[PDB]
């Protein structure tokens, strides 16, 4: 009695945080698979989606 919001997403258990994936935001974010070759330092932070 007092639940503000419920929802559905990716299970933070089958997709463990240790290997392969991470979920702090709604988007399942891994680190380095497709990094833009020739850009600035602040870029490629979206290509990890």
């Amino acid at each position: 009695y007092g639940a503000a919001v419920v929802n559905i997403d990716l299970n933070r258990d089958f997709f463990d945080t240790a290997t392969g994936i991470d979920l702090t935001k709604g988007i399942p974010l891994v680190q380095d698979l497709l990094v833009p070759i020739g850009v600035t330092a602040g870029a490629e932070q979206s290509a990890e989606y």
């Binding site: 833009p36 070759i37 020739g38 850009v39 600035t40 870029a43």
Partner: protein, 48 residues
């Protein structure tokens, strides 16, 4: 009427044109900044 000061063949003492200031210093100079185009590979060369 009035022959020019040259081609007449005599020395004389006439007038000039001047100004007041140091003229070359204003305390400044053209101060421009240049924003870099972001990254390479996406720059357009094909304008012919």
């Amino acid at each position: 009427v009035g022959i020019p000061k040259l081609e007449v063949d005599h020395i004389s003492f006439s007038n000039v044109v001047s100004m007041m200031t140091a003229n070359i210093r204003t305390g400044d100079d053209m101060a421009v900044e240049r924003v870099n185009p972001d990254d390479v590979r996406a720059i357009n060369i094909r304008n012919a």
